[PDB]
Amino acid sequence: NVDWRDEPEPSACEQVSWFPECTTEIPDTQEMSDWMVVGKRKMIIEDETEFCGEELLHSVLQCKSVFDVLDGEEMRRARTRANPYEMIRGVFFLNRAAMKMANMDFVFDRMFTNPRDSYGKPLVKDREAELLYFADVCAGPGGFSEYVLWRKKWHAKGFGMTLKGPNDFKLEDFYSASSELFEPYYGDITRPENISAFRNFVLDNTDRKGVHFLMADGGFSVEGQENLQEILSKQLLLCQFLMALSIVRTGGHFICKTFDLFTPFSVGLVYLLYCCFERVCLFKPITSRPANSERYVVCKGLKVGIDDVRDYLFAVNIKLNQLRNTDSDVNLVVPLEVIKGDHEFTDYMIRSNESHCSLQIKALAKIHAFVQDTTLSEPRQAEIRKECLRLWGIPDQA
After folding, report:
1. What cystine pairs are annotated?
2. Helix, coil or strand: residue 122
3. For a disulfide at 249, which of 75, 82, 111, 210, Cβ 3.0-4.6 Å?
């Protein structure tokens, strides 16, 4: 009962929708002192409708479950044929995540590779021999980094922290290999002492300022429960937000991969970033698969005076470690009354969640149709690859 053919022409052109400007004051310790609420540990996605229509949520949940019955190889072939952006995904870089950063660096006015001061002037010229400093926190640190170092070469310096094991870095490209351009820190991001350690390492190597921007992956995949990833990844997402506030310099930026944002815990986390940055937006680039839940929290311009929020999240993480492996969990980090009190923030959140669900439903329907009719094709895949490379300034090579 879905019409996937009523969809706009696939394009290299992408539109960004930002949250409205926050005009409320950064919360302080006393204001947040009753904000963390502990409750029963819950994994029921179907009734997380504070920021999404119930009917729409159930529809998307329904499509995903039907779609998951499907055999993997068959569905993967169809999804390759159905995705208009399939052909950009693999090109040029050694790591697919590098093309995602390429995509998003372009979309956000090079704010990552060419950050600006308040007068709009470049902070980092090649001449000045001053470095672009960045951090990459993920299961295999190097993919996001591969793009940055390709673009800025020796004018950049990156710090890596791995989410998996000590040697799970991606130091294979000609630049990530040089410890002068990229320094892995020698693996549990949930341990407070590891957070502090990495924070100090980064502060000591950036003149106590912090990095110009942090690139993070705040979610992990699980087979057989796409719906549940938002909940399973909640502590990782908090720790990445906490890392942003710990190592990004004033006026700096933050980009974080996440999944669905239906839960008040997730939305509370976003609300906090929205309080701490000049501009925040939720964005799904064309280089991420249209049928999945992946999106990016993109934060522009860390404000002054965020230490209370940083300290607050640090306390929440400790509480999460305490509640781990018990029937209790932290269910809120900001009260609903506060989040819903900000009407413009809430309107954006609902519009973002619902738009994502509506598009995801169509993308899943399309794949199903491509499974049933293997002659269906997406003819402009090649033209779109070409236009994207040109637009984003990426060589048409390997």
Report:
1. none
2. strand
3. 210
The C-alpha atoms of residue 27 and residue 119 are separated, in whole angstroms, by 27
Annotation-wise, does 144 bind a ligand? yes
Question: What backbone torsions phi and psi does residue 14 show, to the nearest 5 degrees?
Answer: -125, 145
Going from the C-alpha of 46 to that of each of 62, 225, 228, 282, 302, the distances in angstroms are 10, 12, 10, 22, 34
Q: How many other CB atoms are found less than 10 A from the CB of residue 61?
A: 15
Q: Report the alpha-carbon distance of residue 130 to residue 98 in Å, rounded.
A: 24
The candidate with the shortest Cα–Cα distance to 345, out of 397, 284, 269, 285, is 269
Please give the resolution of this entry in Å, rounded to 1 decimal.
2.3
188 marked ligand binding residue: yes
CA distances from 274 to 159, 251, 298, 304 (A): 25, 14, 10, 13
Rounded to an integer, what distance in angstroms lies between the CA atom of residue 366 and that of residue 360? 10
| C-alpha to C-alpha distance for 137 and 245, rounded to whole angstroms | 14
Q: Which two tokens stand for residue 292?
A: 């999945």
* Per annotation, catalytic residue among 100, 152, 170, 366: 100
Which of 105, 173, 217, 342 is the catalytic position? 217
What is the CA angle 203-207-213, rounded to 5? Answer: 60
Q: How far is CA 249 from CA 115, 202, 241, in A?
A: 12, 11, 14
Contact 192, 314 (CB under 8 A): yes
The amino acid at residue 302 is L
Name the strand (E) or helix (H) holding 212.
strand 211-217
Give the domain ranges of the chain: 1-398
Looking at domain 1-398, does it have CATH number 3.40.50.12760? yes
**Can you tell me which residue has the tokens 């280089």?**
287
* CA proximity to 366, closest of 82, 31, 10, 103: 82
Residue 134 annotated as binding site: no
Distance in angstroms (rounded) separating the CA atoms of residues 381 and 373: 18
